[PDB]
Copies of this chain bind each other. A is one copy, B any other.
Amino acid sequence: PQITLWQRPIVTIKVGGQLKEALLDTGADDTVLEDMELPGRWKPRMIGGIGGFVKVRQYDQIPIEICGHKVIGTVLVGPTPTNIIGRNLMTQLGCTLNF
């Protein structure tokens, strides 16, 4: 698809069995999801953004379906107010910024 930016670039994802909405975010190094239940070991991590620093849980090699395409990568889980799809997964969709 081609997605313009007159509104938020929001897509449907499926992770941990659940369908969710998420934001395609070229400013995010990594993918950050709102608190949910995910299986497997994780490791604590700190990320920094506009509101300061937040503590997230880092999950490795987590499968995520984005608009029907299965990708896999690191997923951070924590108290973000919005599900965010980072570059680490957008590369795997073959996604580009065009102007």
Interface centre among A23, A27, A53 (most CB of B within 10 A): A27
Count residues of A near B (Cβ-Cβ below 8 Å).
41
A26 in contact with B49 given A97-B97, A98-B95 (CB within 8 Å): no
Is A1's CB within 8 Å of the partner chain B?
yes
Chain B contacts for A8, CB-based, 8 A: 29, 87
Q: Is the CB of A94 within 8 A of B87?
A: no
The quantity of this chain's copies bound in the complex is 2
Check if B4 sits within 8 Å of A91, measured CB to CB. Answer: yes
Which of A13-21, A35-43, A76-84 has 4 or more CB atoms under 8 Å from chain B? A76-84
Does A61 count as interface, using CB distance less than 8 angstroms?
A: no
Q: Are A25 and B25 in touch, CB under 8 angstroms? A: yes
B81 touches A5 (CB 8 A): no
